[PDB]
Amino acid sequence: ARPKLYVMDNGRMRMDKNWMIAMHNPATIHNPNAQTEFVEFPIYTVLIDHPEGKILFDTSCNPNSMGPQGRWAESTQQMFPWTATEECYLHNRLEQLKVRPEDIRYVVASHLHLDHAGCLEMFTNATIIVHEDEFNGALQCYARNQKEGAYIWADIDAWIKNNLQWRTVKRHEDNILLAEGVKVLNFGSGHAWGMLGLHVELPETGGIILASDAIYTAESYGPPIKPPGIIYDSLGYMNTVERIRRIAQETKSQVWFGHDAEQFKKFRKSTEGYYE
Amino acid sequence: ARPKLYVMDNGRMRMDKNWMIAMHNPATIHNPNAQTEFVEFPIYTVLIDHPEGKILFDTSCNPNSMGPQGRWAESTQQMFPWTATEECYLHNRLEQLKVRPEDIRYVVASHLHLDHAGCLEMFTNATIIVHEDEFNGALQCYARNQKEGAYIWADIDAWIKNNLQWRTVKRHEDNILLAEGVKVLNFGSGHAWGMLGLHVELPETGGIILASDAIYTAESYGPPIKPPGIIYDSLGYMNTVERIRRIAQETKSQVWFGHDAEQFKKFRKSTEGYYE
Ligand SMILES: [Co+2]
Ligand SMILES: [Co+2]
Ligand SMILES: [Fe+3]
Ligand SMILES: [Fe+3]
């Protein structure tokens, strides 16, 4: 197989840096009212144009997330504001590559947060691969009518209404070989209830690990590891980062972080090319 | 009737409220540079004067902790400053009750943080009860010559030099009946590597659970639970709080938090009386 892998720019988000890096700047006796910062970071998705079938990793935010008529709760909009030009919308990014949603064979949902699962509803022809624990957690949010937080009720509503084709990765399930040189990594609980990653082996570029929010940024990764404020299972989170580091070493893979502004700037984006 | 329980005031500590309540005041699009605050909370210990032998729960901070010639690293002193008059030192609080360190049969170390294990070195005739995972973690800090953080190298140094008599609670060990109506609760990992609590059954007052830093304050307790910034095992922490809530219900026990300023105010202090 000679795939082409694309990085698609799906806009920017801002939030308290403490969400990204827990206790990044603790107050001290002579600085008792230490103030935080509102950091900007990229939202992106990855398309693997593979001869066996197109694979999409993450889906960014829904185009109708923000605004007075937005799907996101106002509180969510104020804490995690998403800014994106029309060109940044996933459907537009795919269109400019002459890729229709119906062309996508597999969508790998790293997790079901607002900035990763926003456009799942587009892909009614794909198998949606998601960690069973993440799926269960999101569905409970829905059933419990939770309208605030990182799991968007209106998004989940749409997934169900659109009759998406789910394939859950079981808690103790081994890696899934999706296609030649493409493996779904079962990271389990950490940042969220159930994290999935991808290992891609490209002929030219070599190994890539898509970590998503298992590792927010290079600052997260270190060493030393600097865990997030947004966290479910702290032990699991630490285990996963260390696991990724080992895999990266042993397979000579690059690690692509969830939301690293510096790393993202270096990427060849879908408007400039791809990785072979 | 028989046992007398004393609450001993061991001064005050201040720190970033984010340590106490994680993400208490998140930055937003209209408050992007949200500040924290430096909150004050009590450091206290509990003496159970029991017919079978005196039991001490926690030991506060070492008198030699603060100052330019103090045991605590300057970074620690400025992040977690401890203020206490001489009358607040544990040795003095015990003296004012006509209790000598050598009279203490059991010391229960809830964990080995600087504000709980500070005076362990006093009790050379007691059995020191501590969670094995907490003990191991602290000893690693010592062996690794870690001078920063919540584990005080100089304190640990003193414990070893003073040849304390350790009794570790094993990871999967059942609760320990220390004396009639006094049980050591094995909370395991959460806030720290290994947390111990105490359930005390007093003839008159009834059930008391000493939660220590398993539950910082009533705000922590909720519901809903609001976890701390100082945390090791998030899942374990949550499990422990909910366990305490069940035990409290089933045994009709009060829950005494680790560092709740309002609750501590209400307590009958050792200088005014005791519980029976
Ligand atoms: Co996330
Ligand atoms: Co503590
Ligand atoms: Fe994210
Ligand atoms: Fe404490």
From TrEMBL, chains A, B:
Required co-factors: Zn(2+)
GO molecular function: hydrolase activity; metal ion binding
Cross-referenced SMART domains: Lactamase_B
All residue ranges annotated as the Metallo-beta-lactamase domain in the record: 42-259
Keywords tagged on the record: Hydrolase, Metal-binding, Zinc
Record Gene3D superfamilies: Ribonuclease Z/Hydroxyacylglutathione hydrolase-like
InterPro entries reported for this sequence: MBL_superfamily_lactonases, Metallo-B-lactamas, RibonucZ/Hydroxyglut_hydro
Residues at which Fe(3+) binds: D115, H116, D213, H259
Family of this protein: Belongs to the metallo-beta-lactamase superfamily.
Listed name of the protein: Putative hydrolase
